[PDB]
Amino acid sequence: IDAICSVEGILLLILSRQTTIPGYEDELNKLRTGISQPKVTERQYRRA
Amino acid sequence: PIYTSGLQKMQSSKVSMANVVLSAGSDVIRQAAIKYNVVRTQEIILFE
């Protein structure tokens, strides 16, 4: 169950712009500059 | 066609024979042609 929880978490990290981590907060604005929120939806979420 | 100096050859209601006629030449029916170039600026979807 920890494995599935960690999977869901890490996936939650690269989507859903409304969450950061206590620190860098900028290389996230380097990473997630490829997803182009909000064109992302289910079909895409499940593929991820 | 007007007269020599009379009013007009369509007022006297009297027929005339020898008035003057325009003529064209061999080929005055050349159809016309135009062309356009199209290129669009902003696509519909976009952005990495």
mmCIF file with all atom_site columns, C-alpha atoms in Angstrom:
data_model
loop_
_atom_site.group_PDB
_atom_site.id
_atom_site.type_symbol
_atom_site.label_atom_id
_atom_site.label_alt_id
_atom_site.label_comp_id
_atom_site.label_asym_id
_atom_site.label_entity_id
_atom_site.label_seq_id
_atom_site.pdbx_PDB_ins_code
_atom_site.Cartn_x
_atom_site.Cartn_y
_atom_site.Cartn_z
_atom_site.occupancy
_atom_site.B_iso_or_equiv
_atom_site.pdbx_formal_charge
_atom_site.auth_seq_id
_atom_site.auth_comp_id
_atom_site.auth_asym_id
_atom_site.auth_atom_id
_atom_site.pdbx_PDB_model_num
ATOM 1  C CA . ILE A 1 1  ? 0.000   0.000  0.000   1.00 0.00 ? 1  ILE A CA 1
ATOM 2  C CA . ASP A 1 2  ? 2.968   2.283  0.550   1.00 0.00 ? 2  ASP A CA 1
ATOM 3  C CA . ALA A 1 3  ? 4.014   1.552  -3.024  1.00 0.00 ? 3  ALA A CA 1
ATOM 4  C CA . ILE A 1 4  ? 0.679   2.574  -4.503  1.00 0.00 ? 4  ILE A CA 1
ATOM 5  C CA . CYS A 1 5  ? 0.604   5.650  -2.278  1.00 0.00 ? 5  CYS A CA 1
ATOM 6  C CA . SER A 1 6  ? 4.073   6.723  -3.403  1.00 0.00 ? 6  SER A CA 1
ATOM 7  C CA . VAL A 1 7  ? 3.063   6.178  -7.028  1.00 0.00 ? 7  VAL A CA 1
ATOM 8  C CA . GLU A 1 8  ? 0.046   8.420  -6.615  1.00 0.00 ? 8  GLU A CA 1
ATOM 9  C CA . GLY A 1 9  ? 2.145   11.026 -4.838  1.00 0.00 ? 9  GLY A CA 1
ATOM 10 C CA . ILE A 1 10 ? 4.972   11.270 -7.346  1.00 0.00 ? 10 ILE A CA 1
ATOM 11 C CA . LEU A 1 11 ? 2.417   11.497 -10.121 1.00 0.00 ? 11 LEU A CA 1
ATOM 12 C CA . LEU A 1 12 ? 0.612   14.211 -8.177  1.00 0.00 ? 12 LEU A CA 1
ATOM 13 C CA . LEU A 1 13 ? 3.888   16.118 -8.107  1.00 0.00 ? 13 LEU A CA 1
ATOM 14 C CA . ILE A 1 14 ? 4.269   16.800 -11.830 1.00 0.00 ? 14 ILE A CA 1
ATOM 15 C CA . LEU A 1 15 ? 0.633   17.820 -12.338 1.00 0.00 ? 15 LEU A CA 1
ATOM 16 C CA . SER A 1 16 ? -1.773  20.023 -10.390 1.00 0.00 ? 16 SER A CA 1
ATOM 17 C CA . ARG A 1 17 ? 0.150   23.305 -10.384 1.00 0.00 ? 17 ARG A CA 1
ATOM 18 C CA . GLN A 1 18 ? -1.382  24.180 -6.998  1.00 0.00 ? 18 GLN A CA 1
ATOM 19 C CA . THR A 1 19 ? 1.210   22.357 -4.878  1.00 0.00 ? 19 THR A CA 1
ATOM 20 C CA . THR A 1 20 ? 4.924   22.787 -4.190  1.00 0.00 ? 20 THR A CA 1
ATOM 21 C CA . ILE A 1 21 ? 7.590   21.362 -1.899  1.00 0.00 ? 21 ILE A CA 1
ATOM 22 C CA . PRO A 1 22 ? 9.162   23.254 0.994   1.00 0.00 ? 22 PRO A CA 1
ATOM 23 C CA . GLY A 1 23 ? 12.128  24.746 -0.755  1.00 0.00 ? 23 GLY A CA 1
ATOM 24 C CA . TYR A 1 24 ? 13.141  24.991 -4.391  1.00 0.00 ? 24 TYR A CA 1
ATOM 25 C CA . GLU A 1 25 ? 9.753   25.769 -5.935  1.00 0.00 ? 25 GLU A CA 1
ATOM 26 C CA . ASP A 1 26 ? 11.566  27.039 -9.041  1.00 0.00 ? 26 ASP A CA 1
ATOM 27 C CA . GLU A 1 27 ? 12.987  23.991 -10.771 1.00 0.00 ? 27 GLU A CA 1
ATOM 28 C CA . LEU A 1 28 ? 9.399   22.859 -10.535 1.00 0.00 ? 28 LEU A CA 1
ATOM 29 C CA . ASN A 1 29 ? 8.654   25.882 -12.708 1.00 0.00 ? 29 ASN A CA 1
ATOM 30 C CA . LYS A 1 30 ? 11.387  24.396 -14.847 1.00 0.00 ? 30 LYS A CA 1
ATOM 31 C CA . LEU A 1 31 ? 10.016  20.849 -14.926 1.00 0.00 ? 31 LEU A CA 1
ATOM 32 C CA . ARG A 1 32 ? 6.291   21.297 -15.309 1.00 0.00 ? 32 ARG A CA 1
ATOM 33 C CA . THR A 1 33 ? 6.763   23.778 -18.145 1.00 0.00 ? 33 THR A CA 1
ATOM 34 C CA . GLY A 1 34 ? 6.015   20.927 -20.501 1.00 0.00 ? 34 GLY A CA 1
ATOM 35 C CA . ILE A 1 35 ? 2.564   19.820 -19.424 1.00 0.00 ? 35 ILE A CA 1
ATOM 36 C CA . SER A 1 36 ? 0.729   23.041 -20.379 1.00 0.00 ? 36 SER A CA 1
ATOM 37 C CA . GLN A 1 37 ? -2.045  22.963 -17.812 1.00 0.00 ? 37 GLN A CA 1
ATOM 38 C CA . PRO A 1 38 ? -5.017  22.813 -18.304 1.00 0.00 ? 38 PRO A CA 1
ATOM 39 C CA . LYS A 1 39 ? -5.044  20.809 -21.521 1.00 0.00 ? 39 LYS A CA 1
ATOM 40 C CA . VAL A 1 40 ? -4.564  17.691 -19.366 1.00 0.00 ? 40 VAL A CA 1
ATOM 41 C CA . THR A 1 41 ? -7.480  15.425 -18.472 1.00 0.00 ? 41 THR A CA 1
ATOM 42 C CA . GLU A 1 42 ? -8.310  11.822 -17.645 1.00 0.00 ? 42 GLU A CA 1
ATOM 43 C CA . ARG A 1 43 ? -7.238  10.005 -20.811 1.00 0.00 ? 43 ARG A CA 1
ATOM 44 C CA . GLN A 1 44 ? -3.851  11.596 -20.164 1.00 0.00 ? 44 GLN A CA 1
ATOM 45 C CA . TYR A 1 45 ? -3.828  11.037 -16.414 1.00 0.00 ? 45 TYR A CA 1
ATOM 46 C CA . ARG A 1 46 ? -4.356  7.311  -16.792 1.00 0.00 ? 46 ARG A CA 1
ATOM 47 C CA . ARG A 1 47 ? -1.631  7.077  -19.396 1.00 0.00 ? 47 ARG A CA 1
ATOM 48 C CA . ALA A 1 48 ? 0.739   8.758  -16.970 1.00 0.00 ? 48 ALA A CA 1
ATOM 49 C CA . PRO B 2 1  ? -26.750 57.351 -81.035 1.00 0.00 ? 1  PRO B CA 1
ATOM 50 C CA . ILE B 2 2  ? -27.701 61.012 -81.325 1.00 0.00 ? 2  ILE B CA 1
ATOM 51 C CA . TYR B 2 3  ? -28.620 62.763 -84.589 1.00 0.00 ? 3  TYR B CA 1
ATOM 52 C CA . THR B 2 4  ? -26.304 65.217 -86.303 1.00 0.00 ? 4  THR B CA 1
ATOM 53 C CA . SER B 2 5  ? -27.508 67.944 -83.947 1.00 0.00 ? 5  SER B CA 1
ATOM 54 C CA . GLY B 2 6  ? -31.047 66.779 -83.206 1.00 0.00 ? 6  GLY B CA 1
ATOM 55 C CA . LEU B 2 7  ? -32.229 65.696 -79.785 1.00 0.00 ? 7  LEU B CA 1
ATOM 56 C CA . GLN B 2 8  ? -31.799 61.934 -79.756 1.00 0.00 ? 8  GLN B CA 1
ATOM 57 C CA . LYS B 2 9  ? -32.582 59.005 -82.027 1.00 0.00 ? 9  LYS B CA 1
ATOM 58 C CA . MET B 2 10 ? -34.877 57.561 -79.377 1.00 0.00 ? 10 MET B CA 1
ATOM 59 C CA . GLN B 2 11 ? -37.329 60.406 -78.934 1.00 0.00 ? 11 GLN B CA 1
ATOM 60 C CA . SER B 2 12 ? -38.715 61.125 -82.385 1.00 0.00 ? 12 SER B CA 1
ATOM 61 C CA . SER B 2 13 ? -40.209 57.613 -82.526 1.00 0.00 ? 13 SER B CA 1
ATOM 62 C CA . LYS B 2 14 ? -39.088 57.602 -86.155 1.00 0.00 ? 14 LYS B CA 1
ATOM 63 C CA . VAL B 2 15 ? -36.829 54.829 -87.373 1.00 0.00 ? 15 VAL B CA 1
ATOM 64 C CA . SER B 2 16 ? -33.403 55.543 -88.880 1.00 0.00 ? 16 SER B CA 1
ATOM 65 C CA . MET B 2 17 ? -31.129 53.280 -90.905 1.00 0.00 ? 17 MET B CA 1
ATOM 66 C CA . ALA B 2 18 ? -27.544 54.469 -91.037 1.00 0.00 ? 18 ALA B CA 1
ATOM 67 C CA . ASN B 2 19 ? -26.440 55.141 -87.475 1.00 0.00 ? 19 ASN B CA 1
ATOM 68 C CA . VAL B 2 20 ? -23.081 54.151 -86.069 1.00 0.00 ? 20 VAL B CA 1
ATOM 69 C CA . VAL B 2 21 ? -22.026 50.811 -84.590 1.00 0.00 ? 21 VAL B CA 1
ATOM 70 C CA . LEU B 2 22 ? -19.254 49.815 -82.212 1.00 0.00 ? 22 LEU B CA 1
ATOM 71 C CA . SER B 2 23 ? -17.099 46.792 -83.000 1.00 0.00 ? 23 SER B CA 1
ATOM 72 C CA . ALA B 2 24 ? -14.621 44.833 -80.951 1.00 0.00 ? 24 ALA B CA 1
ATOM 73 C CA . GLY B 2 25 ? -12.152 42.633 -82.776 1.00 0.00 ? 25 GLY B CA 1
ATOM 74 C CA . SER B 2 26 ? -11.152 39.006 -82.671 1.00 0.00 ? 26 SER B CA 1
ATOM 75 C CA . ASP B 2 27 ? -10.743 38.197 -78.986 1.00 0.00 ? 27 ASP B CA 1
ATOM 76 C CA . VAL B 2 28 ? -12.352 40.376 -76.341 1.00 0.00 ? 28 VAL B CA 1
ATOM 77 C CA . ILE B 2 29 ? -13.562 37.426 -74.283 1.00 0.00 ? 29 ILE B CA 1
ATOM 78 C CA . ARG B 2 30 ? -10.362 36.524 -72.450 1.00 0.00 ? 30 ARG B CA 1
ATOM 79 C CA . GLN B 2 31 ? -11.598 35.135 -69.154 1.00 0.00 ? 31 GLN B CA 1
ATOM 80 C CA . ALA B 2 32 ? -9.878  36.584 -66.116 1.00 0.00 ? 32 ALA B CA 1
ATOM 81 C CA . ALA B 2 33 ? -7.861  34.878 -63.424 1.00 0.00 ? 33 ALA B CA 1
ATOM 82 C CA . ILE B 2 34 ? -6.584  35.800 -59.982 1.00 0.00 ? 34 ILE B CA 1
ATOM 83 C CA . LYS B 2 35 ? -4.675  33.855 -57.387 1.00 0.00 ? 35 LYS B CA 1
ATOM 84 C CA . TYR B 2 36 ? -4.140  34.046 -53.661 1.00 0.00 ? 36 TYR B CA 1
ATOM 85 C CA . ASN B 2 37 ? -1.481  32.903 -51.242 1.00 0.00 ? 37 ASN B CA 1
ATOM 86 C CA . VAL B 2 38 ? -2.532  31.767 -47.788 1.00 0.00 ? 38 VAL B CA 1
ATOM 87 C CA . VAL B 2 39 ? -0.464  31.300 -44.657 1.00 0.00 ? 39 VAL B CA 1
ATOM 88 C CA . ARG B 2 40 ? -1.845  31.273 -41.123 1.00 0.00 ? 40 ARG B CA 1
ATOM 89 C CA . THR B 2 41 ? -0.288  32.797 -38.025 1.00 0.00 ? 41 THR B CA 1
ATOM 90 C CA . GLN B 2 42 ? -1.823  31.154 -34.952 1.00 0.00 ? 42 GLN B CA 1
ATOM 91 C CA . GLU B 2 43 ? -2.773  27.496 -35.090 1.00 0.00 ? 43 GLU B CA 1
ATOM 92 C CA . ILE B 2 44 ? -5.715  26.127 -33.146 1.00 0.00 ? 44 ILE B CA 1
ATOM 93 C CA . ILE B 2 45 ? -3.775  24.067 -30.593 1.00 0.00 ? 45 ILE B CA 1
ATOM 94 C CA . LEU B 2 46 ? -0.231  24.849 -29.484 1.00 0.00 ? 46 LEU B CA 1
ATOM 95 C CA . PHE B 2 47 ? 2.529   25.319 -26.623 1.00 0.00 ? 47 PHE B CA 1
ATOM 96 C CA . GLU B 2 48 ? 4.883   22.338 -26.016 1.00 0.00 ? 48 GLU B CA 1
#
